[PDB]
Structure formats: structure tokens, C-alpha cells
Coordinates of C-alpha atoms and ligand atoms in Angstrom, one line a residue:
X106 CA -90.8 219.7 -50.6
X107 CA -90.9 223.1 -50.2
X108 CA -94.1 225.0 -49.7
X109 CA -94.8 228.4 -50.5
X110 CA -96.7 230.3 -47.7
X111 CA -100.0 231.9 -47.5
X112 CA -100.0 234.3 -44.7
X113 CA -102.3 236.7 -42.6
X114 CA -102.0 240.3 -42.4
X115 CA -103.7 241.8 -39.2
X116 CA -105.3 244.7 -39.6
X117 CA -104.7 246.4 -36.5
X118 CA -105.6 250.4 -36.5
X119 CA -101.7 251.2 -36.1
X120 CA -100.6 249.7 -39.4
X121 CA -99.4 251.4 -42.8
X122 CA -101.9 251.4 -45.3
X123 CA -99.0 251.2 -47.7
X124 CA -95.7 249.9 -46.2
X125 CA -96.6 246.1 -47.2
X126 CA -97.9 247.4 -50.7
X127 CA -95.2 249.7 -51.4
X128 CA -92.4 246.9 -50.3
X129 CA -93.4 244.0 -51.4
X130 CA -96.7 244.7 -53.9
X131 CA -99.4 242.8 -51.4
X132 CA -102.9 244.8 -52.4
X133 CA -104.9 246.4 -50.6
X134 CA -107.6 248.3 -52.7
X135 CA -109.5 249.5 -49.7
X136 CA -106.6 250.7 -48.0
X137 CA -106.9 248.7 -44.5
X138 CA -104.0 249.4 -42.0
X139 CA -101.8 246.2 -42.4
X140 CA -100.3 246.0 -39.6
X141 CA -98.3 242.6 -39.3
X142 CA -97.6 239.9 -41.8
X143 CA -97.6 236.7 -39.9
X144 CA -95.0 233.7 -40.8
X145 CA -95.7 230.3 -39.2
X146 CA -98.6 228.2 -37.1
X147 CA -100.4 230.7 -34.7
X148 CA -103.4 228.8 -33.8
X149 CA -105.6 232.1 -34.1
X150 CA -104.1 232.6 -37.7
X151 CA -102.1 229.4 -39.3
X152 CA -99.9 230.7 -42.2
X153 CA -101.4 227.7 -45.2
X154 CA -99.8 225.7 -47.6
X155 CA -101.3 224.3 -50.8
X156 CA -104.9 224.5 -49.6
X157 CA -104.2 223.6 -45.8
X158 CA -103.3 225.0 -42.0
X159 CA -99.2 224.6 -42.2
X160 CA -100.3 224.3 -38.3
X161 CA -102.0 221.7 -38.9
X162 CA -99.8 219.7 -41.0
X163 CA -97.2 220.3 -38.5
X164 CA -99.7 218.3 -35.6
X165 CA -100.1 215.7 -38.7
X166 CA -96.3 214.8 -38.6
X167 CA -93.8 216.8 -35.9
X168 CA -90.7 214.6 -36.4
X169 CA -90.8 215.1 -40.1
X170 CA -91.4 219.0 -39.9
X171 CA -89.9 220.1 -37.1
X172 CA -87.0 217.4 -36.9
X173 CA -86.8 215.4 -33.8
X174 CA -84.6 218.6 -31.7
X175 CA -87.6 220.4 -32.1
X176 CA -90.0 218.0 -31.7
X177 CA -88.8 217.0 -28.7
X178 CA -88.0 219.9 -27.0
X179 CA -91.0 222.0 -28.0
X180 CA -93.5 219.7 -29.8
X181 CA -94.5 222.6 -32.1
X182 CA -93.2 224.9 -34.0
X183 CA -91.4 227.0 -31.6
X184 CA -91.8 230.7 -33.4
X185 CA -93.5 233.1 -34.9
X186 CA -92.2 235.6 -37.4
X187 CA -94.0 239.1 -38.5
X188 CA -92.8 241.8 -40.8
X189 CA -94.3 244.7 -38.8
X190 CA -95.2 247.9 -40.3
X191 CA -95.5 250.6 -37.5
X192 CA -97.1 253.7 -39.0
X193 CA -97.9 254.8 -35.3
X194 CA -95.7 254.1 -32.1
X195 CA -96.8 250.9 -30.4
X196 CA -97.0 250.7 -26.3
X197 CA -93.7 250.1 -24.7
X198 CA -93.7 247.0 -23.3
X199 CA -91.9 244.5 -20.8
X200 CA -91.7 240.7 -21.0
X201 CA -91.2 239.3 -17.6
X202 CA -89.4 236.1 -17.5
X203 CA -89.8 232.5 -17.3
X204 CA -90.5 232.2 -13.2
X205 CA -92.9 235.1 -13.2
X206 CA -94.8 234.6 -16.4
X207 CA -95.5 231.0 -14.6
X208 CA -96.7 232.9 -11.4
X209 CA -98.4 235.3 -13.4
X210 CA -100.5 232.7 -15.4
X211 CA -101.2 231.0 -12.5
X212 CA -102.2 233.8 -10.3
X213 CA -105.0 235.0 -12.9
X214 CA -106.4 231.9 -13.3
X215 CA -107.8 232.2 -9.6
X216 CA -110.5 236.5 -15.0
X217 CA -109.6 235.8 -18.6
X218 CA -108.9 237.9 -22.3
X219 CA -105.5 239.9 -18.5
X220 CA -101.3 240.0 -18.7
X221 CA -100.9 236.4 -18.5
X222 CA -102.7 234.8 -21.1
X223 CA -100.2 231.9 -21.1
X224 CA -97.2 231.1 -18.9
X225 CA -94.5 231.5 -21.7
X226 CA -91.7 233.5 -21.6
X227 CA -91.2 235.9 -24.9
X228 CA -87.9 236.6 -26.2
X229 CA -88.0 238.6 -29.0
X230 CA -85.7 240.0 -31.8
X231 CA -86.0 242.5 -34.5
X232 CA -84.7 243.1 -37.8
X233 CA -84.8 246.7 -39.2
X234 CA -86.3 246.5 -43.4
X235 CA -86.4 250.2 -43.3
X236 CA -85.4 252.7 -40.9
X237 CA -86.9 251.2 -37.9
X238 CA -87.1 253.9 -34.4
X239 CA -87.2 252.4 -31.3
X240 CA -86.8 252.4 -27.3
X241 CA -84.6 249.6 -25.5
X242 CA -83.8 249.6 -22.0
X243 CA -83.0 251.9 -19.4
X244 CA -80.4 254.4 -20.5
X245 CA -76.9 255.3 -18.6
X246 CA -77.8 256.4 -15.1
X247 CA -75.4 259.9 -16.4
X248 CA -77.2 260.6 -19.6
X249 CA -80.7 259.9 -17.7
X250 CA -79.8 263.3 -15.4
X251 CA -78.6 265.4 -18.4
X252 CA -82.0 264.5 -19.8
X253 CA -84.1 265.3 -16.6
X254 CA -82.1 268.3 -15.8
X255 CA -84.4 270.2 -18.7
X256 CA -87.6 269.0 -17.2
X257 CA -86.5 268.7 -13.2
X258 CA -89.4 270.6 -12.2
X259 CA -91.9 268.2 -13.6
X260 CA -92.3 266.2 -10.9
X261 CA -90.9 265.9 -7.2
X262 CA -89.4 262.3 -8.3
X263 CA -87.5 263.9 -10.9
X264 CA -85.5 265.7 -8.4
X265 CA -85.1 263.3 -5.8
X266 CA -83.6 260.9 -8.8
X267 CA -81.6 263.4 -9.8
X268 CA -80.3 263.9 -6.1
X269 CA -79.2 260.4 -5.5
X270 CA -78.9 258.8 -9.4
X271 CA -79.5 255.7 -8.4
X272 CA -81.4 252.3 -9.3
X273 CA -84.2 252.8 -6.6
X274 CA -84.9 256.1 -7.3
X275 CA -85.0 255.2 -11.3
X276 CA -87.8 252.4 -9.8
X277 CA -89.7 255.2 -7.8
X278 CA -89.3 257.2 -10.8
X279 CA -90.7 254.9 -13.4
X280 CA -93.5 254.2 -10.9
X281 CA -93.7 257.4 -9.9
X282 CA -94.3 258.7 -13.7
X283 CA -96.8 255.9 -14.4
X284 CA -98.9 256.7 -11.3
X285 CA -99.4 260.4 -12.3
X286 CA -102.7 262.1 -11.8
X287 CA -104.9 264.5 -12.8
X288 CA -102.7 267.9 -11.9
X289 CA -100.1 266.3 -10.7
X290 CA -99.6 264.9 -14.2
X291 CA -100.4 268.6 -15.9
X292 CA -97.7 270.4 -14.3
X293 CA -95.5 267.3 -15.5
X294 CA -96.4 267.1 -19.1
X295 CA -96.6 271.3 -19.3
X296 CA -93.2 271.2 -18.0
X297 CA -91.9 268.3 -20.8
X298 CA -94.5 269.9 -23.5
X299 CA -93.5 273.0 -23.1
X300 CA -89.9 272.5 -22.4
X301 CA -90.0 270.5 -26.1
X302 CA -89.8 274.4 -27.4
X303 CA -86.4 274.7 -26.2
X304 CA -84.6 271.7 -26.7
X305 CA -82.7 270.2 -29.5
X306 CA -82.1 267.0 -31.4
X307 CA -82.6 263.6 -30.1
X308 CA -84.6 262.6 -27.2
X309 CA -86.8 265.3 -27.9
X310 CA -87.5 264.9 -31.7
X311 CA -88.4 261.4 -30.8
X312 CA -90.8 262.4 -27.7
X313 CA -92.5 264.9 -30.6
X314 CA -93.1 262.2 -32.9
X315 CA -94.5 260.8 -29.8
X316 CA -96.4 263.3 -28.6
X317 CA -98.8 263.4 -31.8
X318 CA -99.9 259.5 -31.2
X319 CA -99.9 260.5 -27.2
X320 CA -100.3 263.6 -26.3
X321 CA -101.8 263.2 -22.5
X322 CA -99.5 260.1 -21.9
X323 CA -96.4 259.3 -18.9
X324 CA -94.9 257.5 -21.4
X325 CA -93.5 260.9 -23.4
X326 CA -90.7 260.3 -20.7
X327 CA -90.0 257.4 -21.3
X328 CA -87.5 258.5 -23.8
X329 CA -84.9 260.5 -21.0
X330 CA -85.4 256.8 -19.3
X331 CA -84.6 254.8 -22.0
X332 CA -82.3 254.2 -25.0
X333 CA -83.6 255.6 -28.1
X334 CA -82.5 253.9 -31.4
X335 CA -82.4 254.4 -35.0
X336 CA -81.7 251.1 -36.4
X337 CA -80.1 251.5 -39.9
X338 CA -81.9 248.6 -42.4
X339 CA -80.0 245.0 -41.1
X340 CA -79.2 246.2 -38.2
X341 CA -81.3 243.7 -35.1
X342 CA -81.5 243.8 -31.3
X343 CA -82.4 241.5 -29.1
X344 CA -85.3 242.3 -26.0
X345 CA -84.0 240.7 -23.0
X346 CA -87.0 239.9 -20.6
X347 CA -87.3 243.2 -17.5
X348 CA -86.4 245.7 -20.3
X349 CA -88.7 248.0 -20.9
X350 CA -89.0 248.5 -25.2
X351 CA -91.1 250.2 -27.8
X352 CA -91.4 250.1 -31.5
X353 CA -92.0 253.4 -32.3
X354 CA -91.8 253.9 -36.4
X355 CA -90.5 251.8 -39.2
X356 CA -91.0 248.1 -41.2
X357 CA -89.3 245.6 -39.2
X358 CA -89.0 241.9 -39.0
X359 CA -89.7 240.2 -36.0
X360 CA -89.3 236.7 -35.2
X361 CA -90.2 236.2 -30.9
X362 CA -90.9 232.3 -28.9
X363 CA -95.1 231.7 -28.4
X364 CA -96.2 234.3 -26.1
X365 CA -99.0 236.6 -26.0
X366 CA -97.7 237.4 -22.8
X367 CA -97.0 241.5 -21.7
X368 CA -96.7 244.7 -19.6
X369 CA -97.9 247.6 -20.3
X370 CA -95.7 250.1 -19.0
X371 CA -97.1 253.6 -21.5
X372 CA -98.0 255.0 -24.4
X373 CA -101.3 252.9 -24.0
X374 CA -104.3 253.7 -22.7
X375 CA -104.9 251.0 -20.7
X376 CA -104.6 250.1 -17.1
X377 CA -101.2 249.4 -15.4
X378 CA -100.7 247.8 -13.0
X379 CA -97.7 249.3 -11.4
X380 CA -96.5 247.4 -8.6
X381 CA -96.6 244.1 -11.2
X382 CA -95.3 246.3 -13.6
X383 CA -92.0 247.4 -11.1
X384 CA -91.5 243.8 -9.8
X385 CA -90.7 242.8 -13.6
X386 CA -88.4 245.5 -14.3
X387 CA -84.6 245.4 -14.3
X388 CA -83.3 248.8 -13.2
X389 CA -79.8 248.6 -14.9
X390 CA -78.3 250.9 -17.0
X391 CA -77.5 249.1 -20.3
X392 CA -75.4 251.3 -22.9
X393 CA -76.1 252.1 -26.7
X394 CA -73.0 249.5 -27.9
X395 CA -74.5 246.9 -26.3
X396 CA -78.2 247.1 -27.9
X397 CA -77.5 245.7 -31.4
X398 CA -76.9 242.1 -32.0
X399 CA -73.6 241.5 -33.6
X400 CA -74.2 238.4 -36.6
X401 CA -71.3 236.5 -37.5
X402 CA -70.5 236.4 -41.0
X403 CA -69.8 232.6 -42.4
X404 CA -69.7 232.3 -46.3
X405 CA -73.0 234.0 -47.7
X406 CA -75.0 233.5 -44.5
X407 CA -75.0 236.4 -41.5
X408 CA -75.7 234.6 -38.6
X409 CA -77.5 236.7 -35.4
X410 CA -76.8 234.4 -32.3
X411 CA -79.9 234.1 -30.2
X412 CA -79.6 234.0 -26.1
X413 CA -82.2 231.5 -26.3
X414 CA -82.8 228.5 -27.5
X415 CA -86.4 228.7 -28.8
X416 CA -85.0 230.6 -32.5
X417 CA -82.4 231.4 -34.3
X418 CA -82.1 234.2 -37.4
X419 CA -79.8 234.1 -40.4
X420 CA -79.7 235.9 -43.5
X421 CA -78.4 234.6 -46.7
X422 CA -76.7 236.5 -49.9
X423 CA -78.2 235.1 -53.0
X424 CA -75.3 234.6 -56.2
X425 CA -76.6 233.5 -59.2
X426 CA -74.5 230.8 -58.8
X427 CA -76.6 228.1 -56.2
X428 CA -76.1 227.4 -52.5
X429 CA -77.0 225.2 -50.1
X430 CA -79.4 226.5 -47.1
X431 CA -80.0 223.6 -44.4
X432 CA -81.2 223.1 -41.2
X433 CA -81.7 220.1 -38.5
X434 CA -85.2 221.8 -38.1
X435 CA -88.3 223.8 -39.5
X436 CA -87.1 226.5 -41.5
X437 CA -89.4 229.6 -43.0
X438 CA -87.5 231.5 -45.4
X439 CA -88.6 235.1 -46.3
X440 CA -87.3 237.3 -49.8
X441 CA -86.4 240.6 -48.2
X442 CA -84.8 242.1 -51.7
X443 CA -84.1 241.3 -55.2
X444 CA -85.6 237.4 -55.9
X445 CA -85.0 234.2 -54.7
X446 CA -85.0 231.0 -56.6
X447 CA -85.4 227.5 -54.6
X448 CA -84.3 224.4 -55.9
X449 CA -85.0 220.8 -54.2
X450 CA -84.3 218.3 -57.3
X451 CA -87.0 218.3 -59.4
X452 CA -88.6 221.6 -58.1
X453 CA -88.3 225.3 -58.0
X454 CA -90.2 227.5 -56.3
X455 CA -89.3 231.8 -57.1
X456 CA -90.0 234.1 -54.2
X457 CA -90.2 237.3 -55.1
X458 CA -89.4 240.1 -52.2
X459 CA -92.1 239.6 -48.8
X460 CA -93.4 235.9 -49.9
X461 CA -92.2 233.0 -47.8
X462 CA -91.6 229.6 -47.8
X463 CA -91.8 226.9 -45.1
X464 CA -89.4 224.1 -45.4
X465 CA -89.9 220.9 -43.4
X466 CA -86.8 219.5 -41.3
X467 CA -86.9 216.1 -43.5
X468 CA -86.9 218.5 -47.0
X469 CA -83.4 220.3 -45.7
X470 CA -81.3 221.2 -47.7
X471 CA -82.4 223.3 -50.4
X472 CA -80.5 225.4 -53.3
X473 CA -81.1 229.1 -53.5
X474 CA -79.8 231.3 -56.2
X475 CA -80.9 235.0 -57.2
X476 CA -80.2 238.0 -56.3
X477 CA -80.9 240.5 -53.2
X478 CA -81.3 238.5 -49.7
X479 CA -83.4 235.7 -47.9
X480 CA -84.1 235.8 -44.0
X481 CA -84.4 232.6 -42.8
X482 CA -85.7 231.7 -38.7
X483 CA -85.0 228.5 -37.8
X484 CA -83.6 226.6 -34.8
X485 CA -80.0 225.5 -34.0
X486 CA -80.3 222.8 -32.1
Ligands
ZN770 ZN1 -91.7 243.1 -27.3

């Protein structure tokens, strides 16, 4: 009824070496980076069931594992959901939307793995397990100038933005900074790099932390152009598509729709292309109290209301007294803390904190009891 996962860590060179061993007590005796834990049906790297692809026993039966919603209106099972251990800061990143990730797709296709690998759009959401730093979106066109005003020298953009604040110039200036060269690019970083000496507090600590990861990168900037957040542990936000983000530091979960699609817009060294890159970006302001998903509290389950209708995220206070969890879909449910006990009749299946367990539309509802909490992505519909 109820199958316990087996999931793939990727290795990528950014991971902790200890976050998922220290967490959740998943070994690693040669001390790899584990970078993300991977919950679902990726076809490069199916989470199993005992053993078997769960992607494949999805294909076997959709209706019964997915429920006919799902079935029907993806034909697959719609997510995927990482925990994410970021020992280094990633690449901030843009997802362009629905119309343009079609274009893009197509457009390539007349090269290969490329931005467009696949012509799905890619919300995202993520879920802070530890203190989890981050950029989000363009900041308040206000406290972008108070930030500049430091570093105004750096770059003859810089002043013309700070001239007229307005959403063009924030476009010439994000292009602007990405398309820095050789001296041009000195003079701008000396001017930030230095200027980091006499500056307190937050952006700056955060460009710093930066700085080590990136120290000849545009993308130190970044941070006087967009939001920088602390999320406190259970504390999501939600990346709208045009938003430039990053995931600097921190153990997150992440739950985003089936693309492999994305923007490089810094703090990567590979090429950008800048005029794609500005046609997929939204130059709004969007302020701090609108960054963090507000859940809605119902009995023991939190509820944080997706935009979209390809997921949806809930997390569930285990008594030791049972309750019911249920779904009209594919549910995976994940221990963050304490243990979890699952009860479907006749069976029980313990999750102890970082193991998961997929549970197919026609094997909702099941019991939990325990302690601590249980993260469960699902679909509404
Ligand atoms: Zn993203």
C-alpha cells in the first residue's frame, strides 16, 4: 500500500559532505558532496520501490497511482521533490514562462545538452530545514539606490540608474553588469571589493560570503538588485517565473513541476546570453512581505497554497494519537523531525527523519502517528 522510497543523492561538487549525514544519518564514508536528495520519477534517476523504478510502476498503472486528476491532466507524476544541501551558493537563476520556454525549445531545436532542454515551464517552491540564505526578485526601486549609492562609481550604469530609478534603467543595469569586460569589470568589482571594507551588515555580509565561491563574478551585485532572505526553518517562498533567484547557503526542501529548463543570469561561469536573458526578466520591484508563502493552518496540517496547479505542499503535526492524511492523487511523504509511523490496515511502515514514502492515489488515506513532522507534496486537484 504504502512503499517506502529508495532515493538518489547527486553528487554534485557544491554539496555538504555532511548536511544529509548529520540530519538524517544517510552514510557517506568517503565523504562525497551530496548535493540533492531526489523524491519521485525523474527518468535520469527514478526514486525505487521494493526492488523496482517507482517511475516505472507509475507508466505500469497511472489511474491507480496518480488518480485520474492527475492522470489526465499530466499523465505522469507531475513533480519532483529534493532536500537540497547548499554548502556553496548555486547560480542565480530565472525560469522564463510557459510561452517562451515553448519558443525557447523550439528555437534550439533548429544544438542539444542548451537553455531549453524541454519546453516546460518550472515553478518552484522551497522549504527552509535549516537556515536556508537566499536571493528572490528584484528589490524596492528605493532601497536598490541606497545600495548603489556605496558603489556609484563602479560603473557608468550605476549612475545613470541611480539618475532616473526606474525599470529600464534597472534592465540596462542588469544587462549592463552581466556584459562587463575585462577593465571595465575591474574598476567595477575594485569599487564593490573594496567598498566591502566599509560597509556594514546585510547586503554586504551576504556579497562576502559570496565573494569566496565568486570572487571575479557580476553576480556579487546581484545582492543591491535583489532581495536577500534569511528564511527561518518552515518558513517557504514561492519563485514566480522572470524573477531572478539564488540559493545561496542552507538545507532546503524543494519540490518544482518537470523542467530542466533555466537562465543563467551570475555567479556561474558559463556563457549568458544576455539579450535572452533580459527578454525573460520582469523588472518590478517586489517587497520583502510579499516573498514568503503564507500556509494556512487546518487541524494538524499547514497548508502552503501553490499559484500553480502542477503541486501542492503541506506539512502535517504528528500526535501520538493517529490521523488521517489523504489525497485524490500521488502523494510522497517525507519525515522532517522526530518519527513517523504509517498505518494502512494491516501495515505499518516507520519513517525515521529524511526517508520517504510514496503513496498511490488508490492507497489514500493513510494513518500517521508519532512525533516531530511529515512534509507531504501532492496535488489538489
Ligand atoms: Zn529555481
Amino acid at each position: 500500500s504504502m512503499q517506502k522510497l529508495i532515493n538518489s543523492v547527486q553528487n554534485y561538487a557544491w554539496g555538504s559532505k555532511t548536511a544529509l549525514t548529520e540530519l538524517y544519518g544517510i552514510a557517506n564514508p568517503q565523504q562525497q558532496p551530496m548535493a540533492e536528495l531526489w523524491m519521485g520519477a525523474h527518468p535520469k534517476s527514478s526514486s525505487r520501490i521494493t526492488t523496482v523504478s517507482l517511475r516505472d510502476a507509475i507508466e505500469k498503472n497511472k489511474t491507480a497511482m496518480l488518480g485520474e486528476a492527475v492522470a489526465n491532466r499530466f499523465g505522469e507524476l507531475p513533480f519532483l521533490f529534493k532536500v537540497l544541501c547548499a554548502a556553496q551558493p548555486l547560480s542565480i537563476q530565472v525560469h522564463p514562462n510557459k510561452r517562451n520556454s515553448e519558443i525557447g525549445f523550439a528555437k534550439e531545436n533548429a544544438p542539444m545538452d542548451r537553455n531549453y532542454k524541454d519546453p516546460n515551464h518550472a515553478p518552484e517552491l522551497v522549504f527552509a530545514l535549516t537556515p536556508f540564505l537566499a536571493m528572490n526578485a528584484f528589490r524596492e526601486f528605493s532601497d536598490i539606490v541606497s545600495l548603489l549609492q556605496p558603489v556609484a562609481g563602479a560603473h557608468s550604469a550605476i549612475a545613470h540608474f541611480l539618475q532616473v530609478p526606474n525599470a529600464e534603467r534597472l534592465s540596462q543595469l542588469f544587462a549592463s553588469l552581466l556584459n562587463m569586460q575585462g577593465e571595465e569589470k575591474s574598476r567595477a568589482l575594485a569599487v564593490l571589493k573594496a567598498a566591502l571594507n566599509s560597509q556594514q551588515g546585510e547586503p554586504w555580509q551576504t556579497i562576502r560570503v559570496i565573494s569566496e565561491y565568486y570572487p571575479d563574478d557580476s553576480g556579487l551585485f546581484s545582492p543591491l538588485l535583489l532581495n536577500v532572505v534569511k528564511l527561518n526553518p518552515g518558513e517557504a517562498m514561492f519563485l514566480f517565473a522572470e524573477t531572478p533567484h539564488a540559493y545561496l547557503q542552507g538545507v532546503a526542501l524543494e519540490v518544482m513541476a518537470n523542467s530542466d529548463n533555466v537562465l543563467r543570469a551570475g555567479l556561474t561561469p558559463k556563457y549568458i546570453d544576455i539579450p535572452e536573458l533580459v527578454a525573460n526578466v520582469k523588472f518590478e520591484p517586489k517587497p520583502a512581505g510579499e516573498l514568503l508563502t503564507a500556509p494556512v493552518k487546518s487541524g494538524a496540517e499547514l497548508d502552503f497554497p501553490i499559484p500553480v496547479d502542477d503541486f501542492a505542499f503541506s506539512l502535517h503535526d504528528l500526535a501520538l494519537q493517529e490521523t488521517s492524511i489523504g489525497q485524490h492523487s500521488a502523494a510522497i511523504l517525507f519525515c522532517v523531525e522526530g518519527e513517523a509511523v504509517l498505518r494502512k490496515d494491516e501495515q505499518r511502515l516507520v519513517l525515521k527523519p529524511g526517508e520517504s514514502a510514496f503513496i498511490g492515489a488508490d492507497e489514500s488515506p493513510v494513518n500517521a502517528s508519532g512525533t516531530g513532522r511529515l512534509a507531504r507534496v501532492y496535488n489538489k486537484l
